[PDB]
Amino acid sequence: DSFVIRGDEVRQIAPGQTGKIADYNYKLPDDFTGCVIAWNSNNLDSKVG
Amino acid sequence: SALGKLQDVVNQNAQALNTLVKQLSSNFGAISSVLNDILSRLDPPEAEV
Amino acid sequence: ASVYAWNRKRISNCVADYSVLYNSASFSTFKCYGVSPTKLNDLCFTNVYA
Question: Alpha helix (H) ranges present in A1-49?
Fold first, then answer.
């Protein structure tokens, strides 16, 4: 499952974690098994304006 | 006190049962000893812990 | 006030709507300890210290 968030929001992507994104965008199960990968894409996603 | 043996058996049984009932109201390290209170105050993860 | 003189306020004898506070969306952290962030709109307290 791929998506984009803010860096400060990477914490919210975790089982049993409460937050706006984790609750209304992408909620993981409490017994989730897997692995979360997050990598910065500022140079490829940020443009002036 | 002529029936001391029978009275003692009754007392032991009653005291064990009362000790169990009293032990039903101990925290054991939880926030509270009331299961309804835990359920109404906490969300699934820490509720189950 | 400053942290070493943190201001304290007393809340009682009123109806607290925590849904609006939780949905303000302007709070960086809303860390609730001992009680859940949700399910706080149906609980009753003798006191609230702010």
Answer: 20-24, 42-45
